[PDB]
UniProtKB/Swiss-Prot annotation:
Region named Interaction with GORASP2: 1116-1181
Species per Swiss-Prot/TrEMBL record: Homo sapiens
Resulting phenotype, K980M: No effect on maturation of glycans, suggesting that trafficking to the plasma membrane is not altered
GO biological process, one term: amelogenesis
Annotated protein name in UniProt: Cystic fibrosis transmembrane conductance regulator
Outcome following mutation: S524R: In CF; impaired maturation of glycan chains
Amino acid sequence: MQRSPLEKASVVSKLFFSWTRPILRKGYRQRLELSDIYQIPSVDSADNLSEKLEREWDRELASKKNPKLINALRRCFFWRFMFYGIFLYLGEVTKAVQPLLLGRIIASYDPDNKEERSIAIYLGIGLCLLFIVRTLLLHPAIFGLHHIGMQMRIAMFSLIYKKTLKLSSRVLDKISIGQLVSLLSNNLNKFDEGLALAHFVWIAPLQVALLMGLIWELLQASAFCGLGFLIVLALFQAGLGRMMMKYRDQRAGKISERLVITSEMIENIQSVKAYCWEEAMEKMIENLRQTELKLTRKAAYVRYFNSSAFFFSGFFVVFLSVLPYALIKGIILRKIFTTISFCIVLRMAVTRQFPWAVQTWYDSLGAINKIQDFLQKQEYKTLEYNLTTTEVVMENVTAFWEEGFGELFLLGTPVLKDINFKIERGQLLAVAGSTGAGKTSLLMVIMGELEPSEGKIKHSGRISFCSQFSWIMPGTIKENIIFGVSYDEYRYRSVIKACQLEEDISKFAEKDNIVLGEGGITLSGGQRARISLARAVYKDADLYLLDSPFGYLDVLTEKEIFESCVCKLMANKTRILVTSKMEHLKKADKILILHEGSSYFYGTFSELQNLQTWNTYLRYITVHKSLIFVLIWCLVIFLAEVAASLVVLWLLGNTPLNNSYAVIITSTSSYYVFYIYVGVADTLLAMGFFRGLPLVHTLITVSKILHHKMLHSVLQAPMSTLNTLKAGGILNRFSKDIAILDDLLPLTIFDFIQLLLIVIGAIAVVAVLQPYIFVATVPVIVAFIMLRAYFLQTSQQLKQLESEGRSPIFTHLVTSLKGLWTLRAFGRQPYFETLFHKALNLHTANWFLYLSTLRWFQMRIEMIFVIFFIAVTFISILTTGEGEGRVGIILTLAMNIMSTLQWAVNSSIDVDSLMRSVSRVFKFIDMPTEGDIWPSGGQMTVKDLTAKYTEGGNAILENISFSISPGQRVGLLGRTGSGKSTLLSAFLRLLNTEGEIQIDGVSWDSITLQQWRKAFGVIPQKVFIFSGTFRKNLDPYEQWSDQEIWKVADEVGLRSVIEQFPGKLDFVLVDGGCVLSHGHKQLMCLARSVLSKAKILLLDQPSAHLDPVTYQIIRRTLKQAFADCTVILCEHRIEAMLECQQFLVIEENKVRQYDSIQKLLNERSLFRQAISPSDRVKLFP
Ligand SMILES: Nc1ncnc2c1ncn2[C@@H]1O[C@H](COP(=O)(O)OP(=O)(O)OP(=O)(O)O)[C@@H](O)[C@H]1O
Ligand SMILES: Nc1ncnc2c1ncn2[C@@H]1O[C@H](COP(=O)(O)OP(=O)(O)OP(=O)(O)O)[C@@H](O)[C@H]1O
Ligand SMILES: CC(C)CCC[C@@H](C)[C@H]1CC[C@H]2[C@@H]3CC=C4C[C@@H](O)CC[C@]4(C)[C@H]3CC[C@]12C
Ligand SMILES: [Mg+2]
Ligand SMILES: [Mg+2]
């Protein structure tokens, strides 16, 4: 890592921006190197900005009665804010005095021998010094203001991420990820570039006051008469401003809902492909856009007028100003043009520099209010008493989830009531019960996530927690198992052999460390559970909580890991466990059987028995045909007004001129009549509400069509290409990159087209009427194009490293919020905060570099304009004839046009920066694609089958072949990580395979893939429940009636489950269905499969954490409903083997098929010895 070149920098280097020069030379003729990126300055690192404002916010919370975040921001930024402001004021004031000096210098060309001839050369020296000081004075302050804005945003982001780790479990249901993603995604680039504009609130009025006097000097009465129009117009813009921020708060609710649905479906697409929910998910996301784009169009129409009140304003401000003076006194053409020159600055001042400033103050304070509101929320309180006898005691505890019923405490039943137990140190509790007893809830009360209404808890602060839903952070298996602490060879090895991952870890190529993705979908269910258990075991504490880690494990692994870890590695400490088997309750010492949130029994086991680039700019215009018709329509009207103005100026110039109306002489006429046109060519060549409206309308329609294709392509792309990319990378584009095509990109293109047409049409009319001005413009034209092409080589490459630099920030914010309970259990906030700071530093490193490279370009293009204007002014003034200097008449006219072009080139750079977004969208659109009555009996014939995830990697299954006769139930089994899911995924052909599986005498290649996947009926291992009503989850296509779904709901047994909630089959599930328990989610997938009547169906461990009572429902529904259809049942519990006839065993990357159970168990002795005594009397009579 190379240090920043800004650190070792001379005043001249920091003033002229010469320190950014290397990366341009490096980036021009080579692709950018990671080495070449510079480390951030020590001033704007994450930790200092966090520390600094964290310190002020605590002081703000301590002192005042009702604290405000702006007051905290004031005390650490205000002086450096206002310090640049006064330079930016003086830099803007020097624009207003430019017409005074240049005015006379134009006037000194007049043969009428005025006093100007005398003063011209001193104006000549002065006006050069005037430009030089402004170019120096402006740009350092803008970069200064951008640099302060970047520090403000990094400071606040750091405070949100600290706040979200201390946030309550009560609040997590209210705030989804879409709330947090949107808040960061809105501010990420808008807040930094805004603080340049923010000062013009108090610059613009003083500028208006300063300009109004200089005009008052020329026109005594009428200038006020003119100003009134701009007061009239400024109120109209403020009206549009308020209107446009009422359309943005309606839409802001909608965007959050779209991101949570988009995140959820892509996070677990493998299930979405199995069920065949492409049509369903696309139509759902389609309906959320409808409302969004309606509000986007309405907001965009009000935004156009706001950005179209400067171009039109021009003609009318001068006309109403000169007309009254003309009627009484008369006017000289010298006077009209000086007024023009003042007017342009005044509008700039009052119609794009005043409405852009206020609008920035609303958004910044609005964003700060949301952050301040977010910082003042209900916190997770901690109350740990290190003093103890290591006595985990609980007495008289009741607990409600929601606030209302708990606070009012007969609204509903509390999940716990009248519980009490005593636990000495060196003994395990067996927490037993049916699905929805409150076993997870009990552990949540022990940790302190769920707060009890009446009762008391006390243990020491040190605690470990193995959750029911396993959580894998991004990184290596080592980084997962140790989890933000030092490494211990003796400890770590002894844990992995106890948990027995030595088998599973040795099969990987990179033995110890393989980089797992967000969630760890590279691993199977069994491998995640044991990693979560290894993380729990490797951690050292007084109390170990274990929320049923033996759900996805087979009986052999389950017994060995129980008799190898729970009773061996830790057997001198309190360790409450969740389980439902006799073998575990025998060795256990204290047993607690919960039922309907009530203690059915409490005691011991013995007692219980006793008891009972060109291509990017071209593929974005040829998505939608309307856009190319509108642009041609604009151009033909543009040609007409260019044509209209030309014959106006033909008649005007060719005039043969009592007529006080307007004084002209042969001399003055020739070199003022043209300049008056150039200053009034901003309105004449303006886009109206006939051209500008449809252009904005179509550009939003392009972003509607692009998003449809993008979401469409991501859904039906193959599995390898979706495992390759991250969660935050997907979520970054649909959040930020699609929001740029809707909001900023439509109106930036309008200003680039508007300014480009003005310059083209200005040069066109001036050139055709007077030839040499085209030749005079050409050397300045080539200078801008030359420098632009040179800059974009570096700029496009920085804008991609920075844009893709955002994915680290989001990816980390997902896992942080996803596995929040484990973070506070272990107490690893200091790790994740410092790990989050690295993401901000990475983004800052790239963003700061891009930002600094831009002002180089912004300064150089102004310097080029200054260098030429200096040359033009002395050539003009020195080569002035004794009468009628024509050299300056030709040259300065060009240099008046180049001011408008300079502004257009700056707009052109803003378009290209926003157009990369569309570039990165098109990468996702251009991804590869996975690509009588038919399933009558459902007999399958496999031959020469092979299964692997990566292309040309390791074969998981090799030369598999077997046969199932029609309407026969088949058992599937093996050791955890055998490949059982891979065999189920091979039928759906989600991963790439070779061979053929022919069904009912017909093969794969004979039919399409989607028509193929509708034959099967799937219950996947990982459950997927998106945000919506129960009826939406049970059938998205809404084929089945309520009578139908209620008819299914009784057999699988969600009768008592649904009726608990207020809206029966209308209750909106949130946070991926956190309201339901783990058992009900298995029943949810069961009902989902029962509805889908399929003559073949595949069950990937239907019973995961179901007790023997709940499992009767599975076999009841499996015997009754699934009558004639063939069943492949992948299950670990041996009770399920009584149902099905044929068995498929998986080992050594190959299969074995068996008819009877006796033969199969006979050859494997350790697996036969693992069978429970209660399940041993069933198999063998
Ligand atoms: N966040 C929540 N909000 C509202 N109700 C909840 C929430 N979490 C759990 N419940 C309800 O509390 C009851 C008990 O929940 P809990 O998850 O502790 O049961 P469990 O014994 O862990 O289930 P399983 O045996 O299937 O793992 C369930 O009926 C469930 O609907
Ligand atoms: N998407 C994937 N990419 C790469 N390798 C994978 C992927 N999924 C699984 N594997 C590897 O293949 C092995 C077996 O796959 P599979 O997921 O079918 O096991 P499983 O039978 O589902 O496990 P369990 O018995 O715990 O349910 C895993 O141990 C894992 O290392
Ligand atoms: C400091 C600012 C806010 C003061 C108000 C604006 C400035 C531009 C105003 C205030 C006083 C004004 C001056 C008042 C009187 C005269 C004399 C007149 O024959 C020429 C113009 C001139 C010289 C004015 C120029 C503009 C002026 C300097
Ligand atoms: Mg549970
Ligand atoms: Mg499996």
